Amino acid sequence: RMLVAAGKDSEAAYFRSMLPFHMVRFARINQIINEDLHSVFSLPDDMFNA
Amino acid sequence: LNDYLLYMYNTRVQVNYGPTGEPLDFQIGRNQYDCNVFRADFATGTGYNG
Q: How far apart are CA B7 and CA A18, in angstroms?
A: 12
Question: Which residues numbered 1-50 in A keep a CB inside 8 Å of some CB on B?
Answer: 4-5, 7, 9-10, 13, 16-17
B7 vs A7: CB contact, 8 Å cut-off? no
B7 vs A13: CB contact, 8 Å cut-off? yes
Q: Judge contact between A19 and A25, C-beta under 8 A.
A: no
Q: How far apart are CA B46 and CA A20, in angstroms?
A: 29
Q: Judge contact between B24 and B36, C-beta under 8 A.
A: yes
The resolution, in Å, is 3.1
Q: Judge contact between B26 and B18, C-beta under 8 A.
A: yes
Closest CA to B28 of B42, B40, B14: B14
Give me the count of residues in chain B. Answer: 50
Secondary structure (3-state) at B12: coil
- Which chain B positions have a beta carbon within 8 Å of A3's beta carbon? none
- Which chain B positions have a beta carbon within 8 Å of A10's beta carbon? 8
Q: Judge contact between B18 and B10, C-beta under 8 A.
A: no
Q: Give Cα A3 distance to the centre of its chain.
A: 19
- How many C-beta neighbours within 10 Å does residue B14 have? 13
What experiment produced this structure?
cryo-EM
Secondary structure (3-state) at A36: coil
List, as one string, the DSSP characters of B16-44: EE-SS--SS-EEETTTTEE-GGGS--SSS
Question: What burial class does residue B38 get, using C-beta atoms within 10 Å of its C-beta: 0-12 exposed, 13-18 middle, 19+ buried?
Answer: middle
